């Protein structure tokens, strides 16, 4: 530290006193997060875990709100042939936010799948089902061979063959009325120029994977100007300790130490505040129990030598912090010969100023020579 | 001009750790609003993910044995996509097919999350 006190002075000598070095401070350990218990994930069971789906014309449509969604399960269990995900995460959907879904579910057919897709041209992309140039969405599709196919063949499931119009996105159409490809008018007769706009899948066990059915799930995902309801982490981040460290609590990143308060606060929990509008306390998203939040070591390191002539040891003042912490205070990677000595072993004394490292406590009291503080000087003399 | 139809081409042979490249022309539809993505396929074995590279060419991602060895490039005008092979191993003999799928600018490994397929091209390393 003598070394460090000359060029801070800008001379080789120095005079008998205290100089004020440097400051100090304790960095945050590794990281910590907190976040409420989570609670009941969004009905996708009834989404991908239930028995029958509906049509590709009369796909079904229902409005996921109001819940929070657990997207891992989608790609953790690996038995769905296509899925992609367009203007949102495949597979970090559990950090992404949207006000509201519109799940479509729907059958198609194997070599329909290539139809199926964003700004797609097809029978299905046009007469069926279609998606905008600016698609935000998911799209999972899965064959339904045992699930949806009849050993005679599943005829139930039917498909818009004609329709006069391309679908416009996000657009059904459940028509049943005659189709009319000629000017001849049908007249409630359907045969030449008159057929029905449905037609019915042959769909069997037997038949190949093209002409299978494969049932389909379209997640469009809106972001509206309304406070989002899918929101947070939806797996997890607990595991926090007690420690000096920067800590993510419910948005506010925050250095300092998290231990217990024993405070009583009203019923609702949120963060807290003092006086000078500076966060003290934060709550327990998971245990209603109540933290206090304080700086860690602050201080500044001071020097205290006599002049360089007569003597040349010297000793530190760390200010306001606790002799137990004073190892860890900005070490274990300066010049081990030569600045351990100073800051740990022997010859420690905790002082209203703080902690004094090299200077060995005497019960004497003498004339004050150099003023460490609070009534408290040092001494060359022996 | 509505189809994405997707051709691979350079594949060879090429010694181990040297450098290569694979060209994959994309002819239909904008290929600029379409992510592209390279995977690699063993004679009688599965389709694997080697790299992936967005639609505005922003970030690049590859699979755990493939990152920093492989690269992936692509241009919008010439409507092709250009995977470079620099530090190559003999795990790499494989047919690389290359596949188009209109998505946004996030990561995309999975095979299922890709919708076209490339006929591939043959490469192989000593």
């Known amino acids: 530290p003598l070394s460090e006190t000359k060029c801070t002075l800008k001379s080789f000598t120095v005079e008998k006193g205290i100089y004020q070095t440097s400051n100090f401070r304790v960095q945050p350990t590794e990281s910590i997060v907190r976040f409420p218990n989570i609670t009941n994930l969004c009905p996708f069971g009834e989404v991908f875990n239930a028995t029958r789906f509906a049509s590709v014309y009369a796909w079904n449509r229902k409005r996921i709100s109001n819940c929070v969604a657990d997207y891992s399960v989608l790609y953790n269990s690996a038995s769905f042939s296509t899925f992609k995900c367009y203007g949102v995460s495949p597979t970090k959907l559990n950090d992404l936010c949207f006000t509201n879904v519109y799940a479509d579910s729907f059958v198609i057919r194997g070599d329909e799948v290539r139809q199926i897709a964003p700004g797609q041209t097809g029978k299905i992309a046009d007469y069926n089902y279609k998606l905008p140039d600016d698609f935000t969405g998911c799209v999972i599709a899965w064959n339904s061979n045992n699930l949806d196919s009849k050993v005679g063949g599943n005829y139930n499931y039917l498909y818009r063959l004609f329709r006069k119009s391309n679908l416009k996105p996000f657009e059904r159409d459940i028509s049943t009325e005659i189709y009319q490809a000629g000017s001849t008018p049908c007249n409630g007769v359907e045969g030449f120029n008159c057929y029905f706009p449905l037609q019915s899948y042959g769909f069997q066990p037997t038949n190949g994977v093209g002409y299978q059915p494969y049932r389909v799930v379209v997640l469009s995902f809106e972001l509206l100007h309304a406070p989002a309801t899918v929101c947070g982490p939806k797996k997890s981040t607990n595991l926090v300790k007690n420690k000096c460290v920067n800590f993510n609590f419910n948005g506010l990143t925050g250095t300092g130490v998290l231990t217990e308060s024993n405070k009583k606060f009203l019923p609702f929990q949120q963060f807290g505040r003092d006086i000078a509008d500076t966060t003290d306390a934060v709550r327990d998203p998971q245990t209603l129990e109540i933290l206090d939040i304080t700086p860690c070591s602050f201080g500044g390191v001071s020097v205290i030598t006599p002049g360089t002539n007569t003597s040349n040891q010297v000793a530190v003042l760390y200010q306001d912090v606790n002799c137990t912490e004073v190892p860890v205070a900005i070490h274990a990677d300066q010049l081990t010969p030569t600045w351990r000595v100073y800051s740990t072993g022997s010859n420690v004394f905790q002082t209203r100023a703080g902690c004094l490292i090299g200077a060995e406590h005497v019960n004497n009291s003498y004339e004050c020579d150099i003023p460490i503080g609070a009534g408290i000087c040092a001494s060359y003399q022996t | 001009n509505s189809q994405v139809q997707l051709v691979e081409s350079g594949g060879g042979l090429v010694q181990t750790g040297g450098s290569l490249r694979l060209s994959c022309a994309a002819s239909?539809?904008?290929?600029?609003?379409?992510?592209m993505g390279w995977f690699r396929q063993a004679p009688g074995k599965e389709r694997e993910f080697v790299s992936s590279?967005?639609?505005?060419?922003?970030?690049?991602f590859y699979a755990n044995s493939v990152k920093g060895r492989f690269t992936i490039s692509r241009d919008n005008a010439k409507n092709t996509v250009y995977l470079q092979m620099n530090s190559l191993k003999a795990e790499d003999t494989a047919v690389y097919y290359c596949?188009?799928?209109?998505?946004?600018?996030?990561?995309?490994?999975?095979?299922?999350?890709?919708?076209?397929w490339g006929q591939g091209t043959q490469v192989t390393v000593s």
């Open positions: 590279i967005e639609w505005n060419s922003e970030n690049t």
């Open positions: 239909g539809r904008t290929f600029s609003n379409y992510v």
């Open positions: 596949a188009a799928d209109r998505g946004s600018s996030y990561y995309y490994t999975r095979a299922s999350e890709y919708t076209y």
